[model samples]
Target: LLPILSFPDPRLRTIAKPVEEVTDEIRQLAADMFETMYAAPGIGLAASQVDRHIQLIVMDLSESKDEPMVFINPKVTPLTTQPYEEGCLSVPQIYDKVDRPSRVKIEAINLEGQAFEIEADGLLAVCIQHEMDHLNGKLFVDYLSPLKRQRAREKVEKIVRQREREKVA
Candidate 1:
């Protein structure tokens, strides 16, 4: 599984390069990302989170975990606005309410390199916007106030240290 780039990592701030073509490698990478996300127990993941600056996102919002969605080089147009709680795999345990479009129109490419569009709302809309932000080198914490962002950073760094200690143990 690809190691998720934690907050404060320089790679996470790097804007993803657009995918020129969807090849077998890209498909396999997406599969691996989905595996990593499910293992992390996260609902969405972007290639940038894994330190791969490529335009790709994997999401699974299905209660049964049967439906997996992939978006390559996605573009989102906000249709309406609402407030929803959001989280990120890269940022670990930090979650906060964010105001985003309740509905959005998404244009993206599939694994087959075919273009597709989706009109999404509710949790799906939130997830789409969250993951899309990653491609642009942005984080959910960016929407938070400065004090909250500092607190989140401190907490995340402590978690990182704990993981390092565990590795040594």
Candidate 2:
């Protein structure tokens, strides 16, 4: 499904539940999610962004769109105290410098639910941290300063209202 990206949805702030099994349903969802991410031209996507409260995230950093990376049940271990500017597909048109671990090691399943772990840094590390935050009911806006948060909320509200207007029209 196309990810529903907006703000103030309780689902957005909810910590997703981890998957207990790699059932056919989960696999199907994963495939659909990949499709959705590509459709958005996004580099990474989280299930929570789609209103599915599960600890699942999809990432594709390859130059070839055909080869996207999937990370399931990913755990961020030992992050750098350093901060950097980060953005989210859900929180479009907003980015802020937020300190994060320079390095991260995470264990997650692939689209096939095969368990795997790897260490990443720079954009890789930033992407992982950003997506992982989604699974825990957080948004990139949370890292923004108070003024920025207010502005973001205003922008989000405007988008929501415009969408509502379009829906009625």
Candidate 3:
């Protein structure tokens, strides 16, 4: 598992490049990403979150943690807009509501070097839009109001401090 880049890190704002093809290297990173995500105990993760600037995402929303999905170079089209409560691994302890595409169709490549399409809604769709934003150097707090957005960094900074204390203790 890899350590995730926290919120407000400039690296997290870097836009990702597309993966040329799904090769053994891509598969290795995919596996590492899933391990990172599952260990973070999060439902979603993006390559950008781990300082890998590639269009890749690994997510699982199932309760049993058995259902895993990966999307490479995902192209999403929003079908409907809906506001959903959202959280980010990069911005831990900072939950907010953001207007997102409730229904979406995404075209992406799977691990086996095959292209696939998925029409999704509910949490899955919201999760898709969230992680996709990372590929473009966007964060959920970016959609919040000015004060809320400002508070995100202030709050996250505290968590960073505490985490540092633990690490150095």
Candidate 4:
């Protein structure tokens, strides 16, 4: 599994560059991305989050974990608002409701290197927007309120401590 880059890593701030084209190399890397995401317990995986600096994101919104999807060089157009709970694999366990704006459509390339357009709302919109932000070097935790951000830091630190303890044991 590809290691996921964590929050506070400045590399996460990098503007991911778009691939001129997708090839078997990218497909293999994307396969590892899905494996990492599936192991990490989330729906989205961005190449930027793995420090690849490539404009690619892999995700699965299915409850069954069977409907894996990938987006390359994505473009998002929000057609319409409200708070939505958001989190990140990079941010670990911190989750906060972000004030979000809505029903949306996206144009992106598939794993086959084909261009496709799809409309989405609800969780799908949020997922696309959130993962899309990764390629642009954006993070959702920064959109959270100040207090929640502080709490977010504390909780992730706590997880580190717990993991450290387990490692020592």
Candidate 5:
């Protein structure tokens, strides 16, 4: 599985480059991303999270894990507003209620390189928007105030330190 880049990592700040063509490699990467996301137990993932600066996102919102969606070069437009608790794999162990468009229209390229548009609502809508933000080098934590952001960063730092110590041990 590809390592999920955690917050405070400089790579997460890099804006993703638009995919000019969808090749076999891109498809393989998408498959691998789904594997990584499932293993991470996350509902959504962006290419940037795996240190790939490409406009790609994968999500599975189905309770049975039957539905898998991929979005390439996605453009999300918000339609309605609702508050939902959000969390990030990169920013682990942090959850906050965030107000976001409850409904969204997303235009994107599929794995087959076919252009399509999807009107999403509820968790699907929120997931798409969240992943789109990552493609633009923004994290959900950015929506929080400075104080909250700082506290989250510190918590993440402690996690990093603990991991380093475990490695040394």
Candidate 6:
């Protein structure tokens, strides 16, 4: 159930749509997403990265698999002025410390269609912002300056093309 990770391709910039209702389809999607996330060894994942332009995210920040967190149609409201280092599975091997709000109140539905809100800061805040940015067609590198973004794009494209060459060689 490994999902395809998009490159710095324009496709990744497409904004995702909100899931209308939480049905069996949504549940299955959430399951697949979690499976992919775990395989990626990432704490969280957004559906948009898998070319499923739906407002869904899966995260398991705990050792217990039973504590999986699903955010359906998550809406984040920033609450502070702070920043932290962030990373993403899509843009692999490229990480940067970006300034973001400290406290954020996120409203989203759980796996069981139960609405909930989680307020977090520090690493939690950084992780949440990173995933939500994906939903909005924003990459972690987007927060960086033009020079930084250009450098990152060049590095990622080189690695991507090298992988392609190796695949076909």
- Report, for every candidate in turn, its global Cα lDDT versus the true structure: 0.92, 0.81, 0.92, 0.88, 0.91, 0.82
lDDT per residue, candidate 1, 1-169, as tens digits? 8899999898898999999999899999999999999998899999999888999999999887779999999999998578888988888888898998788999999999899998998898999999989999999999999999989999999998998899999
User: Residue 86 in candidate 5 has what lDDT?
Assistant: 94
Q: Is candidate 1 or candidate 2 better by TM-score?
A: 1
Output the worst ten-in-a-row residue range by lDDT, candidate 1. 79-88
Q: What tens digits encode model 2's per-residue C-alpha lDDT throughout 1-169?
A: 5756687667788889989888888788878888888876778888999988898888887778776777878888965466777767676656688888788898888767688988898778988888999998998788777888888878877877887899899
Q: Ten consecutive residues with minimal summed lDDT in candidate 2? A: 78-87
What would the per-residue lDDT of candidate 5 be over residues 1-169, giving only the tens digit for each residue? 8988888998998999999899999999999999998887889999999998999999999887769999999999987588889998899878887788889999999999999998999898888989999999999999999899999999998887897899899
Q: Count the backbone clashes (under 3 Å) in each candidate.
A: 0, 9, 0, 0, 0, 0
Better candidate by TM-score, 1 or 3: 1
TM-score (C-alpha) between model 6 and the true structure: 0.87
Which digits, one per residue and each the tens of the lDDT, describe model 4 over residues 1-169? Answer: 7878877788999988887889999999999999999998999989999999999999999889999998999999998786788889989987778766578889999988899999998888889999888888889988877787778778877776796799899
For residues 1-169, what per-residue lDDT tens digits would candidate 6 score against the true structure?
A: 7564756778778899988889998899888888987876778888888888889988887766566888899999898567666777787667788988888898989877889988988777777888999899998887789898888878888877886899898
Better of 1 and 5 by lDDT: 1
RMSD for each of the candidates: 1.0, 2.1, 1.1, 1.5, 1.5, 2.2
The 10 consecutive residues of candidate 6 with the worst lDDT sum are 2-11
Greater-TM-score candidate between 3 and 6:
3
Error of 4 at 140 (Å): 0.9
Q: What digit string (tens of lDDT, one per residue) describes model 3 on residues 3-72?
A: 8998889999999999998989989998999898888789999999999999999999999989999999
Error of 2 at 146 (Å): 1.4
lDDT of 2 at 58: 82
Best-to-worst order by TM-score is 1, 3, 5, 4, 2, 6
Q: What lDDT does model 6 reach?
A: 0.82
lDDT of 4: 0.88
- lDDT over C-alpha atoms for residue 137 of model 4: 85
